[model samples]
Structures are given as C-alpha cells and as structure tokens.
Target: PKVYFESKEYNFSVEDEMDVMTFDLVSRLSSATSSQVDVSYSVAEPSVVDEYNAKYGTNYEMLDVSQVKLSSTTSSISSGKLYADNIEVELSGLEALKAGNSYVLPMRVHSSSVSTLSGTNIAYFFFSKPLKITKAGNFSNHYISVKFPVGTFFSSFTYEALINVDYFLDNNTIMGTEGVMILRIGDAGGGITPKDYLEVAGGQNYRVTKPLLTNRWYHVALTYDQPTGKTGIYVNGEKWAGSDWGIDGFDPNSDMGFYIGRIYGFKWGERPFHGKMSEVRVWSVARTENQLKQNMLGVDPASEGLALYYKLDGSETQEGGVIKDATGRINGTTNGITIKTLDAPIAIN
Candidate 1:
C-alpha cells in the first residue's frame, strides 16, 4: 500500500489575522486493506523554504512554527478502506505579516504501516499577503504637512517618491524642511539654467544634468551621508548626479515642520508642485543604489530605518484632512491635494 498527499503544492491568500484550512491523508492499494494503516504528518524544516526561494527567484520567509496548529498529527485508514481521516491546519498571528510579501509552510507525511510515496508525500504551502494600491495624491498647487515627534533628526537619510509631473515651474518642491534639506525640481537660485532639472538642496545645491519632461512618471531618490558629506540623486534607479556638501545633517527642529510638494514658509502656493505622487518614503539611513531599485514598486511598512512612509492609497479623507502613515508613527495633513484613483506609476516585478 502507498500513502500520499492529494497535491504537492497548495497556495493560499492570507486575508485575515487568523485562518483555518484542511487537507486529507489517504492511501491507495490495488485491493481493500486487510489491516489498518497509520500515517504521521509533520512540518518540514526552515531550510526547505530557503531552497524553494532560491530555485524560484522568490523572496519568501518561513512561517513561524509557533503560529501553526495541527488538529491531529496522526491519522489512520480503517481496515478494508483506502482513504484516511482529514487533518486540519490552523494559522494565526497573520496580522504581523507584511503586505506585498510572501510566506511558506512546508508539510511532509510518513507512514509506518504503508510505504509513503516520495513523489507526493511532501507538500509546499505558499502564502501571499496582498495590498492593492490604486490611488495617488494629486499635488496640483497643493502640499502636505507632517509633524514628527519632538527631537527628530537624521544624520544620514534617504528620501524617495514616485511622481508624474504636470508642468515645470520656477521651483517645484518635492519634499524637505526649509533651509535644512530640500529635494526639488528647479531652483530659484540662478545656477541651474534648465528649470526642469532635479536638485537636492542640502549644504550645497546638487543638480542633475538631465532635464525631466512634463507629464511623465519617474522614480526619484536622494541620499546623504553625514560622516562623509556624500550626496547623490537618482532617477529610475540610475545615478544622475552627486557631490560632497561638507555639512552635518538635517534637523527638523530648525523648521516649522516637514512639508511635501512645497517648501516651508514660502509664499502661499509658491514653489508648489503640480503632479501626482505615490510611495513617498523617508529613511533614517542612506540607502544603497541596489536597495532603491529593488523596492521601486513598494516596501514593507515595518522595514528597519523607515522613518515615515506614505502610500497615498486613497485612505486619506479631505474632510478629515489626514494622510495615514504606513509606519503608524506620523499622520500628515493635506492642504489642497486630493487622492485620485491612479494605477501605481512604477511597475517592477
């Protein structure tokens, strides 16, 4: 007699904090079994998930063993029967899982009374956490204001966003604290002749030579290291420009607050951005080029060094005037921007 699982692979979408699923343990024989066959089930080791990811070019973390509960580890096929009892698997602590990430739980079966089929005795369970982002913040002559906790400062930092420019004005502020740090398109200061070029204004103004056209989506990032005063500007994961500013860092205590789409204390509507924005993130550490390219679409909200993350995914209410932060640390307020249903601008698998 041979015992095996019905399938070698099972896929599940985790939609809630807790979920339950069941599978059957069975045996096959040419004739009715004269004696009972007992089978045992167990989860495979973590190394199994590591191998699966390497072979599939996937990033799947192993599900914690503590979160899984097996209804029964042992099942038996009665005499003169070919089928065995069902096994229930319950998974919990799903709320801690990150959206847009994958997880795996490998299961294996064994039998003392029957031969376990090597081809079908092992099963791989794949779990996916989905987050549908369908909206972006329209920053047409608008901006957002965020207040960090008292004494918030960054010695090394990175600022990133996905933007679709509507038009190029004299100065289109992307984000920054006035006089401390600012990432903007064009600058009032006359050094940069082409107003469409991107600029990072820290200790010194570092401008990209390439000019950005209107009405095109782009992934823009700026990183700065305080120790070396090294700064860089990137577009679509490629380095466009860099320089040494010879400065310390940015301290929010010097400005009124951190503003997006416009600089602080500027004339009302002055230097405002006319565009659509999404996946705006601020990190406490200077991110590498590879890290910036890998997460162009989205990132885990619970990621380390993530100071503030705003997906701008239609969760904001104009009436309430609040933009929820993914990190749950700071919620921003909208001035005149509206959350419009726009497919994410960047697509990277």
Candidate 2:
C-alpha cells in the first residue's frame, strides 16, 4: 500500500509536548489490508530566512530541531474507499521549530506489504507564529494617505476607524494637536448614506456622498493645517470631502496617539477596520490634491511635514510583534488584530 500527507498549517504552542498531524493521501495501490508505513519529519527550510539570505547576498540558515514519530498503527485500510491511505504522526516539538519554519513530514509504506506499490509520499506543515496586528499616531498639522480596500462591511450604526487620534489631555474633547478619524462611514448616510467620512474633532466629519465600491483599492488623503485652520479629504487625488474646516485647536507639541485598523478611546463604539489597509502616512501640514497625487503611490519619509509613516507590512516586527512605524516617531502596538497584506495599490482611485 502507499500513503501520503496533505499540506496544512498549524499554530505553534510552546507548552505542548507534541503536535498532532493528519495525512490524507490517495494510494495508487490496493487498500485490501493494513500496512506499516515509515514516518519521518524535519524542520523545513525557512522561507523568510531564504529571503533574508538573498537580500544580504549570503547563505544564512535558520536551524530547527523538531522531529516526528508515527503512530503504532501508521497505516490502515480505508473503510469507505479502496485506496484512501490514512496516516497520522505526532511531532516532537521545539520552540525553534515553531518560528517561521515549515515542518516537512515524509511517509513511505514499509516493506512493500502490498507488493505492487512503489515510491513514497511527502507532505508539509507550515508552522505559523502568532498573528501580528497594528494596535495605535500623529498630531494636528496632519496629512494622511492610504491605499487600501474597504471590503469589510458592518451593519447597524457601527463605524469603522481606519485611523483614530486622541488628544493627550482630553480624550473626549478632541483638542490639542487634535487627531481625527479616517472612517469607513457606516450605514447611517440616510439611504444614500455615506460610505466614507473624513471627519475631525468628532463633529466636522465630512461624508463622501458618493458610494465607494468595496474590495477596490483607493487613494485616500486627509490634510489638516493647524496654522491655517483647514482640512480636506482627497479620494484618488480628488477633493471628496473637505472644507475650510475649523481649526482642531490642539497644541502641536501636545502628547497624542494615532490608531490604525482600530481606535483607542471608543474601543467599543468605534469598530476597527474590517479589511486590508496599507500605505498609510501622516504629515504635519495640509496637502493639496496635486501634492497628494504626486506621492500617492508611496511615501518618502524625508518629505516635508512627514511626521509618522507606516508600511503596515502586516507582519511581526523584528522586535517580535508590533507594527513597526517607519516614521521613526511612533510604533503602533498590536492588540487583538493582525496585519493583513493584500493586493498592491491598483490606481489613483
């Protein structure tokens, strides 16, 4: 008889002594009788490690010492079908085996019990560490740009916060280098309700009257110049929402924090973003449509007024699990959410 395993994923738990694996391989030969199978496993070549190797033009190996042991009844005849090979193994686990490395388990029917079968079967297990998420931002002269999709939907009066800012002194008053919300405005736009809102100070929320198609990447920008008392929202470099809005009256040097993918103060009321978000940037000055259009594709940290920037790489930071802020100003800590990478920015719209 022949047996094989299928590709799958598993979470690594350091405390667990053994991790269980199941293989569902189709046997080309007969399943008329039970057969012995040799099961062996090893840590896979780390993909991320390879990426780092190629980047640095060096050969660096990430080592792991995980092993696998097959069950006493390694193989059995299929009860329902003639050639369904059922196999199972217990992985003797290690912490190093769990981090960014795949576990490969190779199985072979032993001793040719069926006599007709040849060759072996191999399968892989991708060991994933815990997920990483953006858990927190910038001040009053803020300009933000995002190229992301708004596919995650919500009902009721629930509004999703793409970016939430809180004034250090009064989280309620929304003052002092005031932060704003780049919101996927919920279902309350009055039938023709707004799908997006570029709101500020908790009141002057500008609702983009047009409906934004879901699952599409769009360029959204919010520019607020504290000295000028102005704010604007540009969608794909068009002024979708903005006015000579009132000043946020927040001190430039005041302590403030920004939230992406979720909010800080209204943890319950303001739902975090439901879908993928990326290319988020913040500057200290309001930017015009042309300014936003010029750099809509990506950001340069050296640019003027660039206060905070995040690639949201949607992966654990080298330091372990935070969304590393590229701006060199603030690093967004993760809560219960994880960074999700999706398609690159499609277009200006």
Candidate 3:
C-alpha cells in the first residue's frame, strides 16, 4: 500500500488582525491494508522551500515551524481502511507578519507500514494578507472637486488611485489641478496611437512606456520631490517613468481647484474619465515605491503626511452635494458621482 497527501497545494488569504488560522490535512492509502498502519507528518526542511522557489521563480519565504502546530504528528488507519484520521494544522501569530508579503509552509508525510508516494507525499501551503476594498466611485462623464484651504500647498507630493477604465479617450484626466499638475491618459498633444499611456504633466511632461488595457484594474501613482527635482510615475507599485523634472513645486491653492476624474474647465477634447476609481489619495510627502505598493488597496485614514484622502468607499462622510475627506481635513463636491459595489476589485495574490 502507498500513502500520500490529498493535494499538492493549498492557498489562503489572511485578513488583517486575524490571530490564528487552521486547516485540515488528510492522508490516504492507495489500497486497503489488513494490518493497522501509521502515517507521520512533519514540516519539510528549508531545502524544499529553496527548490520550490527555484522551480517557480518566486521569492516566497518559508513560514517558521514555531508558528505552526499540528493536532497530532501521526494518524492511524484501522485494518481494512484506506484513509487515516485527519490532522488539524493551526497557524498562529499571523498579526505579526507584514501585509502584502507571501509565505509558504511545506509539509511532508511518511509511513513505516507502507511506502510513501514520491510526488504526492508533500504539500505546500501559501498564505498572504491583503488589503480589502469593497466600494468605488463610478464616474461617467463626471468628476469630483475638492477646494483646499488657502494655506494648502505641496512642495513634495504623491498622488495615488485605483482605477479601471471602461473606455479610452484622448486626454482622459484621472486627477489634476487644471494645467498646473495633472495625471491623465494620453498626452497634451492628443491622439496617441495606443491611447493607453499614462502622462504626468506639470512644468514638464513625463509619459509611461507601458500601455494599459481597458476593463482591467490598476494601481497608479505619481510622486514629486521639489528639493531634488525628482519625479516618478508608477503603475501597480513599480516605477514606469519620470526622472529629473527640474521643477520647483505645485501650488494647488493658486489653481481653481483639485479635481478627480476630470481636469478643471472641461476644455474641448480634454475628456473626463469614464471608469471606476477608488483609494484616491494625495500626500504632502513623496511616498516611496514600497509605501505605494504596500497600501495600494487601502491605508489608515490618519497616516502621517496624508494631505487629502478620498476612499470613495460609499461609507464616507457625506453632506448635501459634498463628499467629506477620509482624513477629515477637506470635502469634495460630487458632480454626478455614484457608488458601485465591488467584489474584491484587486487580487490578493
């Protein structure tokens, strides 16, 4: 008789603040045995994890065995039975792990009464803690305008949003302070061939080399540091373009207002975005790539240096014709903006 694991891999999405998680691992015999058989399980050595990473081209870290507890190290199959008792594995201290990083635990099964199968004797458990977003603002030829206080100015800033474009149009403004600073699709000259490139315009124009596809969600961010005259345009946490812009800083207070989903004045051919947007944020500090990638789906409302944050998650503080900021510092007027329920718009892994 041969004993083996039920499956080769298991995946799990761990939510924030979850203390412990448990799963059942089952071992089975290929044929019934006349005598009782015992199967033993153990956490595989680190070499197994190294081999997996080499084969899959992944950088997953091995989950420490100290965090894992098995209900029993061994299970017994009674005479004439093909299945052994289930072993309950529990993982704890999940809150100590960082979000957005993946971990793997490799398990190996062995038996003295029967030979263990070569391929099915091992199993891998993958775990990741991802941010969750439940709602987004649906914009169709519409926009939102936020009026900053008179003293508000950004010498260094980072703008971020999660967007899924419904259709492409030349110069589709994602967000901007009119002509002063803007993040949009296509370029100022208009009529790009692909029509999906991202543009960051201020004193200088920077374009992303990668073209985006329609109907797919992406995390986009633009960062600028005035001291070094450095700028960066990021797509899904990776830097795509932008270098020394040689600009000074941005004064949104001097512009008409800061707008989301459209540029100010609604000029001819400068169209508003027709898509879903969420996690719209503006920070007074130039956030690094790690910060942008880690909090793509969501972030704490009270994060430091967060100047204006609009989750657009439908639970926002709303008054007549206005959507209050998640940071409670400002409010944005809604123009035909509506909320749409989302089914985990961003993938966990």
Candidate 4:
C-alpha cells in the first residue's frame, strides 16, 4: 500500500514536544460584521495558533518578525511593499523533529474580511507561508521556504510574502520584504543570488503566480522527485507547476520538511506572510491536477477542509452558508477558479 499525502491536526500547544517546523503563519483580516464570518484566530500558540505541520513538512511564516515596511502607497496602513500586520509569534519545540516520517494534513479554510479595495484586489494581497526545518545528519536546518512565487518579469516583486520587510527607511528600499498571500517566483528562488536561498536553483522565478481559488477551503500538495528537478504544486488536487526549469527540484532525501505561510529565503531577514492559511499537506508523490481539483470540490482524504475549497459545488455558491462539496470539475471561470475566499485567490486557474 502506498500513501499519497500525510499530515495530522494536533492541539495548538508549544508546551508539547514540538517538531522543528519548516513553516510559519500570518493573518491580515479574520474579522467581519458577519458572525458567521467575523472569525478571529491568533498567531500565538494554543487555541490561537490553531494549525500545525505534519511529522515532516514546511510552510510559510506568519507575521513580520522584523516589523519593517517599505511602502509605495500610504492609502492603507496595511499596504506596503511587504504587506503584513499579522499577529506574530515564535516557535519553541524544534528538538523533537524527525525526517522521513509519515504524515498527512487535510484541512480547509474560510476567509473573513472587512472591506475591499478592488474586486479581489484589496480583498486579496500577496501572502506567503514559510517554514524552517531541522538540518540533516545533525538536524542543523536553517530555513525551509515555501510560497506562491508570483511576479512579472519587470515589476518590483510587489505583493509577495507580505509579513515583514526591511523597509530601508532612508533609501525606501523594501529589503527583505514579505507579502502575504502573493509572491514573485523570480525573486523568491534566488533570482540571481545563488547561496542566498536554501532551495538555490537557477532559472526563472515562479512568483506567487496564481491559484484557482481563495478565501475558501482549498487543498495544496508538495511532492519531491530526487532524480528530476521539480517540486509539484497542486491546488485543490490540481497541478499548477512542477520542477521543470519553471520550478525548483524535489528529492526524497531532501533536507527540508514543511512550511505553510511564507517562504523563508526571501533575500531579506526573517520575513512573514499575511493571511488565514490552513490545512497544509505534504505527499511523497506529486498529486495530479485532477486530483487536486477534486479536493477543491470537497472530495478525497481531506474531507474536513472541504469548506475552504467549494463555493457550493459545480459553479454554484455556498448553499445556505454551508460550504459545498466539489464535483471535481472546474466551474470554468476564465481566471482559472475564482477563490470564494473574501472574493477569490485572483487567479484564472
């Protein structure tokens, strides 16, 4: 028997023997007028930190540990080159981490926001979910980075890992910037700076390219292929990218674990992401795009997190506020699948 993905849900307590994780988290807005939506979660431990990684996984970091911001616009105190005002926290249990273990993480989410700047613009900003892992042999891991890796060829890598950025207050240079929920793949994978990142590979950076949905429960999977140079990206059980020059590489013996919120190696200091990130998973093999999409409609092993993916089901909206099961078929939206989170992940997926 072979397992596709593995992860578990544990009580949010740092007091327990915690594993040195590869992910971090951040939050932008979880409050709303709707009691059904005005949901509030914490970046701290216990019932607040809420989510945890599987035995071996990496994800994005939550909140700006540096407390720096480089702004191009001042219209919103929440807006900046690296947009993150997320509640911040630190990890304690790293000694208990082990490599090459079994894990499965099936979860979902609902996005609760207050206002909007554009359709899915203000509603959706670039955010990240980073993870730092324990090194191999002696478990001397430094950083485990993960991200949406979105950016254009000429832009300033805006709307990326938006948690914490080194706002060069004097030069106005957002050094070490993190955008929540969005990313610029080019700069993220050490655009040109080798040795600067853990997953140092050469090619075009992916950027937080895009996702099919958002603000709703969706499933994501990351698998490794040692012989090849690819890390498969699956959303809602759908393949978005792979380690095919357009991506980094994946190997079974990889030293990295799991990251959830923001990518760690962002050419800056410890930055963070801003958004409600939940139900992170890690698999041995790359899930097919069809499989990921099936989970989007509320199928597969990740049954609980279904609410985070479907609006209702099959191009329909949530029924009576109840998150619907996916039919494993795309709604046929142009921008891919418009995430029902707040509005959507802003992708044509």
Candidate 5:
C-alpha cells in the first residue's frame, strides 16, 4: 500500500503498508511539544479519509488555512506550521491592531459520528458547547421538533444518542429532572429499530413505531399535554402510526437545561450522536397536525406559547456561535462545532 500526508492532500500516496507507515507518526506524536495538544489523529489508510468524506465531507482536515486578514489589512509578519498533530500559526507585529475590531480567518470542519470513525482511526479535534437554556423553563403542554441529517450505522453494537435535556448544576444534587430526557436512533444489533427515548430521571423509556431510514433528512416532533398525559410523535409532518406515551408528565420548572449532539457530562460509555441538527423548537402549547405540517416547510409560528426556538445556524465569526432564539426568548450558545453548510436532505429542504 501507499501513504499520504496533508501536503496538498499529499498529492498521492507513498509505497508502504500499515505498520511501517504509521510507525513514524506514532513516534513523532510521542515526542514532547511546546504547545498544548487540542486533538490529534493517525490515518492508517486512504480509505479511512474516503469513508469520512463520504459521510461528513472532506474539507474537515485540520489546519486548512489560507490568507489570514486582520481587520481588512493583511499583516506583513506571518508564520504557520504543523508539528506532529499540533498546529501553530502566528500573525505578528500588530501593535497598531484595533481593539474590538474583527479578524476573519476562513476555515472548514465537518461533523461525523463518534462511533463510525472509532474503528477507522481518523484523529480529529472538535469543541462541544451544550446549548444551555438561558432562563428557567420546562415544557408542560408543548410541541417540539428538530431537523437534522444522519448516516445510518448498523452497528448492532451500540445505540447512538442524539439530544437531551436536564444538565447538572454545580451543586451536588438535582435528580428526576424537569424533563431530563434522551432521544436516539437504535442499531443495537446491527439491526434497525425505531426511534427510542429515555428520561434520565425515572429511566422511563418511550418509542415510536416508525423506523428512520439512513442517509436522509427528517423532521421529528414530540407533542405533550399534561391534562390527558397525552404525548405523540410526528415524523416529517405525519403522525407516527406506531406511537406510545410513557412519560408521566412534564415539569415547567424553568431551571432545566438541554444538550445537543451528545450526552450530558460526556462521561465514558455515554453514547454520542454523529449528525447534523437544526431548527430545534419548543412550544408551551401542543400544535395540531396542520400547524406542524404547514410549519415544517420553514415557517415559524406567530401564535403564543412559543418558548424556545434555536435555528442552530449561527456564525462564530460575528457572535461566538450564538444559537439565535428567533422568537426572542431562551437564546442558546454553541462552541465545539462549525456551522453546517451542506445541502439539506428532502425534509429539511
């Protein structure tokens, strides 16, 4: 086999097998460096990058930088280099640089599943900032929906976790949260199962009869009304034909927070989701089928009861990856991810 490097995608591969090729990489990274390590990776073969590109796009390679501009004036003193897996760049002699002005350095990073890339062994660095509920809040009678793209991984080995609510406080307590729930797509035995849910507090599990297909866009929703203890799921505007409500009820305590794309605290064995999610919304009132269907096409509801609505489409370049609350309440923030710009699947379109 041949080897490749990040030098222009390294142009072409060099002749060598896995062990011989990866030995140098392992050696270099083992040595000490001056700067702290953010993230590192070892690519055994070209196909690993190929599969990564197929799933998350190829532009995600680390340290892909071009011209760096400082407030519209290109700096004369500049330097950039890669050591082992660490990247360091210096733009210097900016004694005249203005305070509060911006420097725009363009780059790209693709989001991928934490599981699929596990065995392939591609090193990557990403930041995670769980979207925290700004104000104290919880859904009582509510309708919530989120849109995202995913590649089906028929692992039969694990269930991939998606979004969740009810993060911990600094204090040593907080149990059976207002709605500390986990939502996920299951492939426990390399077999496709329906979307499943679990409340972190009571450990109560819920399910929808419909199975989600891989490699597509989907608009998934949940509706709950405390009066009847009624709850339901809607997939892409249609009610899930096989749906059940196992939740006891919701507590609108307002202090509950939420996490996107990973489990709370990210402790070991806590499954993380690998996919793109957008247009997450929450309503204080349950919405009808017609209302959900009509709004699934990108319309925001103007009626009352809209509590939190995050379009997960924000630019850190301007505002620190701020997840805009379109309805003007409960705005959230994100870090460990670059904004997704890929073409939307059919449902998201």
Candidate 6:
C-alpha cells in the first residue's frame, strides 16, 4: 500500500484503484464575494501550456476569467458555496468554463456536512453560461457524483446524494445522441436500482433514484464520455454505460461549460451542496484502470490531470489547470498550494 508523506513528493499513475482529488482550504468564505484567498495562476501543464503558447503565445489569450461577484445583498445573489434558511451568498460569473465544447469535469472532495452560517449550511456550485453551437448535434455534458472508495473490505454500503441539472442542449438540430441522465461507477451493492443510480429530468421532475448525500468524505466522480469515439466512461476501473436504454456515442473532443452549484444558461436558481470538497480534477485523456490506480497511490510521474481547475488558488502544483497534493488533502485553510513537492500523476512510469 502506498503512503503519503508531509515533505516527500509522490508519482501516482496507479490504475483501477480508488482515488480522489483532495482540497486544502487555504482561505475561508467569510462573506460573499471578497474571498479571503482570491488566487490567480499561470498555466503550466505541457498540453495546456503548449496549446496556450501555440494559440496566443503566453498572453493567457484563449483563457477568459470572470466571477459571479458575490455581495451581501443576499436575495439578489443567484447561487453560492454556502447557504442556510434565509441568509445566503451569490456565486455567479464562473471563473473559466469551457462552454459549448465537450470536456469531462471531474470533482472529488472531503465535505464537512457539519454546520454552517444559515439553516442547512448547504453549499452550491452553479453556472449561468450557455453553450455556443456552430454546426449542430453538439450538446454540453456534465454530472455530480458522491462515492466512498471500497478497498479489500468489500462491505455493502449505501450513499445519499441529490443532483438537479437543467440546461439548454444548445443545438436544436443536434445530429448527435444524448443518453444516460447520469453515469455511475463502483461495484453494485445496496438496494439501488440502475435507475436510482442515474436519472435524467427537465422541467418535469423525474425518477426515484436520488442517493442520500452524506456529510463525510466520499468520492464524487462525474463525466460525459463520448461513445462515438473511443472516449467513454468506465465505472470503478470498468466501462461506464449512461442509461438502461442503451450506451451510445462519444466524441473525444467537444466544447462545454459547467456551473459549480448552479445551472448554466438558466435563470435565478440554486442547488447548493454543503460539506467539504477535498479534491477536484479534470482530465483531457480518458483515464484507464492503470491511471486510476496511480491516482489512489500517488504514483503518476506525468504532471497532468485534466481540463481546468474550477476552484484552484495557486495551491495545486499541476500545469494544465490541475492539482495533486502528495501529503494529504489540500485544505484551503492550511498549507496552501505546494508546487515544490507537487509530483506528476498522469501516466505511470
């Protein structure tokens, strides 16, 4: 079994193993907007850096930065990281979202689920941006997940979670296909039906498969893998099939954007999630069982995770908008982003 050290760095390219993104809270969200730690960073990952350098060449051109601009006004704010009965915060203006383009957004965190400023202490991640379709048959992809990594102890466990996604497909004449309201991984157990695991709905509230979200640290992995191309989602080191109807297409490359706790292209709404988010990672290449294993043991030497860091604050040491903390969970309140000990964790050595 691989272990984590405080000072030593590690390379985790492990595959088919339970892994997750850890968060080190560098700053706390005291009041809305003015985050105690409003950090901005430069691209470093070779792929992102190379593309950035190739496209605009070092000016951070293709990248557009913005925020929802939090304020104390409360009611006016669309969504926020935390919320209670009446008191609330607004989280609008997503930092850097790849809308219209289809990119898999993966997030893993250790939540508090303990207490909060308001009623339930619910925290929400949302997006209000819309996808831009040029040709058609292109729709953005997304998902929110909650999981607990099962080791040699194969115990039957049940998790609780709630996911509500409403957005514009973008293209009215989309020539592609849309399957699986949600994709799930991990071995089958508990009294959960395939439907209860993954469900899709619009203005009409759908199925009866909502997992009860817990306050403990659980792995939540969500993705929109394209079956059309070889790029598709696989569960717990296994292939992932979206819905019961049937597994469909996957395009390795597509453009899209996601709102942390809010719906993109939609109006004043909120679906906040309260708790601690330890790790959040995005992947450019579809990870294999080996790569997944690397994530668990901290062994990938290649410093690559995925697309962009939605909640990064110079704390992560990866290059392409990604982060991997070798020591432990990168808590925002503790030892910020340590680039020195930051090791590579893409493809194993």
What TM-score, computed on C-alpha atoms, does each candidate reach? 0.72, 0.43, 0.64, 0.25, 0.41, 0.27
Name the best candidate (by TM-score).
1
**Clash tally for model 2:** 8
Best by lDDT: 3
Task: Please give the ranking of all candidate structures by lDDT, highest first, separated by commas.
Answer: 3, 1, 2, 5, 4, 6
Predicted candidate 2 versus true structure: per-residue lDDT over 51-157, tens digit per residue: 44587664433434346554443444444344445445555445434432233333333333444233233333334433222322222322221221123111101
Off by over 4 Å in 5: 1-179, 187-203, 241-248, 252-256, 266-270, 301-303, 314-322
Specify the poorest-scoring 10-residue window by lDDT in model 3. Answer: 186-195
Note each model's CA RMSD in angstroms.
Answer: 5.1, 14.7, 7.4, 26.1, 20.7, 25.4
lDDT of 1 by residue, 1-349 (tens): 6887665677888875545444443434334578988888888878877777888888888888888888889888788877677777877778787767888888888888878877577777888987555678888777778787777888889999988898988788898876678889987556554679998764467789889988677889999888888889999999999988766676854655688987645654458898888899999999999999878768888999998887776654444777668888877777656778765434422
Ranking by TM-score: 1, 3, 2, 5, 6, 4
lDDT for each candidate structure: 0.78, 0.42, 0.83, 0.27, 0.35, 0.25
Model 4, TM vs. native: 0.25
Model 3 lDDT tens row, 128-173? 8764677888988787787777777788999999999998876788
Give the clash total for candidate 6.
94
For model 3 the local lDDT of residue 223 reads 95
Off by over 4 Å in 4: 1-240, 245-257, 262-268, 297-349
lDDT of 3: 0.83
Candidate 4 lDDT, 231-342, residue by residue in tens: 5544445455554432333221122212323334435533332222222232333444554543332234343322122222124343332322233322212112122232
Q: Is candidate 5 or candidate 6 better by lDDT?
A: 5
